[PDB]
Amino acid sequence: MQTIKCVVVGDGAVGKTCLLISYTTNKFPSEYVPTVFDNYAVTVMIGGEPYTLGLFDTAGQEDYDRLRPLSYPQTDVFLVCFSVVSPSSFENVKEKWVPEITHHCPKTPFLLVGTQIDLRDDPSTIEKLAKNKQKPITPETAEKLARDLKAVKYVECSALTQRGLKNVFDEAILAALE
């Protein structure tokens, strides 16, 4: 079956699987299970026309670094994820992820996706970061990284509340259709 192939990458525990489960099933898995690779599929109506989206979930672990590229052939769009409450994952978008997808799929577009956006105003999360001299990534910081790495655009979401979640994938279709 032909689809808009959309591959999802980013550090472990950034929230990729949840983002996929939450979007495609409307449920949030409570338990964490590190993913090797999984396929998902959705249908999105655009102006009364069906558009079919093939969603490839990949491993955030370094141990599957050599396995991941098997998900890459003939990709139409990438989602490069980081958690807005993990400056660590934000940095790896730049040192690891973008150079990785660029290498395997040059000139195929990608979106910068900010995740776990509901925890950006959580005081418990904010203080944990502050103890490490760290702070959440603001939308405006992320938009700056997007322009610098030549991403199509920056989108953000919470998988828990689903805020901004539909938009991620509507924007992914648009990027893949250009």
Ligand X SMILES: Nc1nc2c(ncn2[C@@H]2O[C@H](COP(=O)(O)OP(=O)(O)NP(=O)(O)O)[C@@H](O)[C@H]2O)c(=O)[nH]1
Binding site as annotated, residues for GTP: 10-17, 57-61, 115-118
Which residues, 1 to 20, sit near ligand X by CB under 6 A? 12-18
Query: Candidates 57-65, 112-120, 137-145, 157-165 — which segment interacts with other proteins by CB under 8 A?
Result: 57-65
Residue 63 interacts with other proteins (CB under 8 A): yes or no: yes
Hey, CA dihedral for 170, 31, 88, 38, is it positive or negative? Answer: negative
Residue 99 Cβ, how far from ligand X at the closest point, in Å? 18
Residues with Cβ within 8 Å of 35's Cβ and at least 6 positions away in sequence, in order, are: 16, 17, 57, 58, 59, 60
Burial code (b: 16+ CB inside 10 Å, e: under 16) for 72-94 equals beebbbbbbbbbbbbbebbebbe
Which residues, 103 to 162, sit near ligand X by CB under 6 A? 115-116, 118-119, 158-160
Residue 84 or 159: the one with the smaller Cβ distance to Mg ion is 159
Residues with Cβ within 8 Å of 4's Cβ and at least 6 positions away in sequence, in order, are: 51, 52, 53, 54, 76, 77, 172, 173, 176, 177
Hey, CA dihedral for 143, 24, 159, 62, is it positive or negative? Answer: negative
Site string for other proteins, 21-40 (x = CB under 8 A): ---------------x----
91 binds, among Mg ion, ligand X, other proteins, none (CB under 5 to 8 A by kind): none
Which residues, 22 to 51, sit near ligand X by CB under 6 A? 32, 34-35
Site string for Mg ion, 25-54 (x = CB under 5 A): ----------x-------------------
Residue 67 interacts with other proteins (CB under 8 A): yes or no: yes
